[PDB]
């Protein structure tokens, strides 16, 4: 299968702003006919992709002339001069001329903010579902900027890695910042096997990890 | 003018089979490719393969012939895919595209395709009060947990619709065929314990719980 890496996976951009992504084939697109079927599209969070360029940098019909597709062979170019909000969702780009066909792994465009370090909280489990069985220990990671952050559970110093599940939520409308939930199940009595339960988080912020913890 | 409306079985058991249908406007069906993409959350998007609807055609991908089978019906302009011997990695959102030969250009709404052994499961839903003593500065963060239920979706509500500020609703992730939803509230340090804040959640396939946050 031929492999599409894009360049960035995460694009901060004021409003305003030109915008480059780039989508590297790991072999040349240009095919016997000497079309390049390289294709570019737009996914905004709640449906569908959109087309955007044909064949390296035609535009389609409605796209605005502020999208500019360039590069040829492996290395191709997407770039918005004046991004709008429109204009924010995923970006993908597209290989025809090898089956099977690929996308690249997308590119988000979000707004970019000041760093804000998180807000972490821990939660042991409540009355209610150790008398019903199990153990819930939540830890909510609220309002941080950028999205790269790294959480993990440790429980008496050991790292756990089965039983936790963890939810984003999209950038935040009027905020600009990201939260995250990490959910840590375990038994009742297995809960009752151990005591400090910890829920350290890494992230650009600070140089050294955010430990909430309890026992 | 031109659509591919998608309409297809979404809530099945593993070892089943579901047929998601794609009908074609606004253009000569015939004249065309229709090409099926696989989607699984969070995640890119995979080519499945693609059928001329003129010939009856067809082209897949190794990964998935076998899996999907593609089929046209002319005398109605709607396409469709044959999903078999379903697995938990085949709950994605699978789109159909109009395309040419090398490429799509206009997409199909998406049909989301759960596989779940549930059944319709009332959720339990727990308050998550702060941890305890050494904690808060001007703000306390509450939570809510709803777990264990099928299908989606559920409303998470504060105090019956006011109490907007400060929370955030984690998309729900299915872990062992049912899924868990959680929520954050933040509020000032003299709003709690004094001002009672309650959760709500409902769940259209059952039944209503209102929960409140003590200690």
């Known amino acids: 299968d031929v492999v599409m890496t894009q360049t960035p996976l995460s694009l901060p951009v004021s409003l305003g702003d030109q915008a480059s992504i780039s989508c590297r084939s790991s072999?040349?697109?240009?095919?016997?006919?000497?079309?390049?079927?390289l294709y570019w599209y737009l996914q905004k969070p709640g449906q569908s992709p959109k087309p955007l360029i044909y064949?390296?940098?035609n535009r389609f019909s409605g796209v605005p002339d502020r999208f500019s597709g360039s590069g040829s062979g492996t290395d191709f170019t997407l770039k918005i001069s004046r991004v709008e909000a429109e204009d924010l969702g995923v970006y993908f780009c597209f290989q025809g001329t090898h089956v099977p066909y690929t996308f690249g792994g997308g590119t988000r465009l979000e707004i970019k903010r000041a760093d804000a370090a998180p807000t972490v909280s821990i939660f042991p489990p409540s009355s209610e579902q150790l008398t019903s069985g199990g153990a819930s220990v939540v830890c909510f990671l609220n309002n941080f900027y950028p999205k790269d952050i790294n959480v993990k559970w440790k429980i008496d110093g050991s790292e756990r890695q089965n039983g936790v599940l963890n939810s984003w939520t999209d950038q935040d409308s009027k905020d600009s910042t990201y939260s995250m939930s990490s959910t840590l199940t375990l038994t009742k009595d297995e809960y009752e096997r151990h005591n400090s339960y910890t829920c350290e988080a890494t992230h650009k912020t600070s140089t050294s990890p955010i430990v909430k913890s309890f026992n | 003018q031109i659509q591919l409306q998608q309409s297809g079985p979404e809530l099945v058991r593993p070892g089943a089979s579901v047929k998601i249908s794609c009908k074609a406007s606004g253009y000569t069906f015939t004249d065309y490719y229709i090409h099926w993409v696989k989607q699984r959350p969070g995640e890119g998007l995979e080519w499945i393969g693609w059928?001329?609807?003129?010939?009856?055609?067809?082209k897949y991908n190794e990964k998935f012939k076998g899996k999907a089978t593609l089929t046209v019906d002319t005398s109605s302009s709607t396409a469709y895919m044959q999903l078999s011997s379903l697995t938990s990695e085949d709950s994605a959102v699978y789109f159909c595209?109009?395309?040419?030969?090398?490429?799509?250009?206009?997409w199909g709404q998406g049909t989301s395709v759960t596989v779940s052994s549930a059944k319709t499961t009332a959720p339990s839903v727990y308050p998550l009060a702060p941890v305890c003593g050494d904690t808060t500065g001007s703000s306390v963060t509450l939570g809510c947990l709803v777990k264990g239920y099928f299908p989606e979706p559920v409303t998470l509500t504060w105090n019956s619709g006011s109490l907007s500020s400060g929370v955030h609703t984690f998309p729900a992730v299915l872990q062992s065929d049912l899924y868990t939803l959680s929520s954050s509230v933040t509020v000032t340090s003299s709003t709690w314990p004094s001002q009672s804040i309650t959760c709500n959640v409902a769940h259209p396939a059952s039944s209503t719980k209102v929960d409140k946050k003590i200690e």
């Open positions: 064949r390296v940098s």
């Open positions: 595209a109009r395309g040419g030969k090398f490429a799509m250009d206009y």
């Open positions: 059928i001329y609807p003129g010939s009856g055609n067809t």
């Open positions: 072999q040349s697109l240009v095919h016997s006919n000497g079309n390049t079927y």
